[PDB]
Amino acid sequence: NPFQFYLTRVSGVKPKYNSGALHIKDILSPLFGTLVSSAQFNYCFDVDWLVKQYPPEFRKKPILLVHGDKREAKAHLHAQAKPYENISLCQAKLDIAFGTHHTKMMLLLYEEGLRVVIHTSNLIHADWHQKTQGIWLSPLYPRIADGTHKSGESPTHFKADLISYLMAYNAPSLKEWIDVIHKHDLSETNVYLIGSTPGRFQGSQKDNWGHFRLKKLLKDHASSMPNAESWPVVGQFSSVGSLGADESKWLCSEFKESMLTLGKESSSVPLYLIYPSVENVRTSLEGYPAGGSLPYSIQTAEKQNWLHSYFHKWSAETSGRSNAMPHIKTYMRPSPDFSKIAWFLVTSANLSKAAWGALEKNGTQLMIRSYELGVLFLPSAFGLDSFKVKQKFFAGPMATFPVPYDLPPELYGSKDRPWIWNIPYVKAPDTHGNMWVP
Numbered sequence: 001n002p003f004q005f006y007l008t009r010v011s012g013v014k015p016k017y018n019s020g021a022l023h024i025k026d027i028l029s030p031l032f033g034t035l036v037s038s039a040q041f042n043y044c045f046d047v048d049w050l051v052k053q054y055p056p057e058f059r060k061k062p063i064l065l066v067h068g069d070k071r072e073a074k075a076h077l078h079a080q081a082k083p084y085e086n087i088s089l090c091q092a093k094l095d096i097a098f099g100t101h102h103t104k105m106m107l108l109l110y111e112e113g114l115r116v117v118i119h120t121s122n123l124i125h126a127d128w129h130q131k132t133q134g135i136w137l138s139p140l141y142p143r144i145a146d147g148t149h150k151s152g153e154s155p156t157h158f159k160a161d162l163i164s165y166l167m168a169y170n171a172p173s174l175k176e177w178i179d180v181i182h183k184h185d186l187s188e189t190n191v192y193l194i195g196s197t198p199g200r201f202q203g204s205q206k207d208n209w210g211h212f213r214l215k216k217l218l219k220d221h222a223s224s225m226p227n228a229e230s231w232p233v234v235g236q237f238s239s240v241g242s243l244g245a246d247e248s249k250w251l252c253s254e255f256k257e258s259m260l261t262l263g264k265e266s267s268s269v270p271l272y273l274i275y276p277s278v279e280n281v282r283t284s285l286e287g288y289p290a291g292g293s294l295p296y297s298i299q300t301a302e303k304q305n306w307l308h309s310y311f312h313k314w315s316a317e318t319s320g321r322s323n324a325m326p327h328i329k330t331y332m333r334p335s336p337d338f339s340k341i342a343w344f345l346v347t348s349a350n351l352s353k354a355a356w357g358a359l360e361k362n363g364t365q366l367m368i369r370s371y372e373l374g375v376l377f378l379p380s381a382f383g384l385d386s387f388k389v390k391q392k393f394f395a396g397p398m399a400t401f402p403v404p405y406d407l408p409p410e411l412y413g414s415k416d417r418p419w420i421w422n423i424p425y426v427k428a429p430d431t432h433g434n435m436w437v438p
């Protein structure tokens with residue numbers, strides 16, 4: 001495979017469904033490189049657990065933790081790290097209310113080169129235990145020889161886009177990593193970077209982030225096919241924000257409009273949203289506690305019941321993960337019979353205005369509250385017109401894309417309800433014998 005898209009290992013499925021999966025210990029093993037320094041961008045950290053995932057010989061190398069915590073949460077994280085002299089912290093600035101640092105990324109500096117890992121898991125035991133999570137692994141990027149002048153840039157502009165993303169933090173500890181990236185050759189990268197950073201973007205900066213970044217890439221590097229209006233859009237996420245009183249406020253007006261872009265020329269396109277039902281969570285490997293990582297509140301949900309008609313159950317027989325609740329987020333554009341896809345995106349961005357951006361000031365300004373990061377797989381970047389869908393995720397032409405859940409997605413039944421984490425479920429017990437009482 002040329003895609004280097006992996007799922008995390010799931011405890012409890014048969015070995016066939018973990019064969020090509022990765023645990024964090026595998027990512028940090030010496031087989032992937034001789035570690036000199038690393039940067040861990042994330043939302044939630046368990047520092048004691050994290051350090052034990054590094055191999056013993058690497059546990060004293062410098063680690064930078066990039067986080068968004070403030071006030072007491074920030075103090076708690078500093079206290080967690082205090083015992084480990086080699087750990088530094090970088091607080092990402094969040095100057096817009098209700099912003100979060102959701103980006104999940106590792107920068108791994110080796111003796112032999114550099115690797116970038118963009119993924120969806122928090123750095124806590126439970127996120128790597130029985131969840132469906134996604135990982136993109138970069139190639140080993142070699143160092144550019146001292147005295148040599150070359151860009152080290154890929155046809156997807158990944159090196160410049162990653163530096164641009166890091167420059168948005170305006171942070172001294174990340175300027176060091178920017179200088180490291182400058183000195184490496186990233187020309188073999190075949191994915192496009194799609195990031196969100198907080199701010200209000202107009203003019204030449206409007207296309208840099210969020211769903212306008214996606215729109216711009218799809219206009220420039222995908223081609224429209226006849227009957228494009230028949231190719232659905234699929235979104236798959238672990239959390240939903242407040243989208244407004246109806247679909248025309250944001251979901252189908254600006255979000256779906258960005259996602260249905262193809263090619264340069266100027267809607268009944270179906271929209272499938274995949275989000276775990278209550279039954280999905282109850283019968284999961286973790287049981288109801290899996291819902292602790294699916295933070296859809298009743299307050300938000302009650303304001304947008306129109307949205308739930310779009311919801312489809314989580315099903316993942318193709319990867320043996322129907323009972324491993326998703327914390328991956330993915331977006332893609334399948335053909336009407338779901339045998340091909342025009343593109344695939346894996347990201348930290350949930351279905352929310354905070355992450356993807358919302359238009360302001362008479363449509364002239366895109367406002368984003370949070371940091372997010374994902375990678376976009378475009379057929380043109382692999383010399384193809386479209387991707388064939390792999391029929392079994394862990395099965396064996398390597399030009400077929402490993403989609404991790406079942407297609408077509410299955411609509412909620414009439415008795416199904418979206419998982420809502422702050423109401424009780426006491427009618428039927430979960431796989432551990434328990435109810436859910438918030």
Ligand SMILES: O=C(O)c1cnc2c([N+](=O)[O-])cccc2c1O
Nearest residue numbers: 043102120121122292293294295
């Ligand atoms: O991975 C993330 O980016 C992320 C962010 N926030 C979460 C919350 N929360 O408090 O919003 C509750 C539960 C799980 C969360 C999570 O998994």
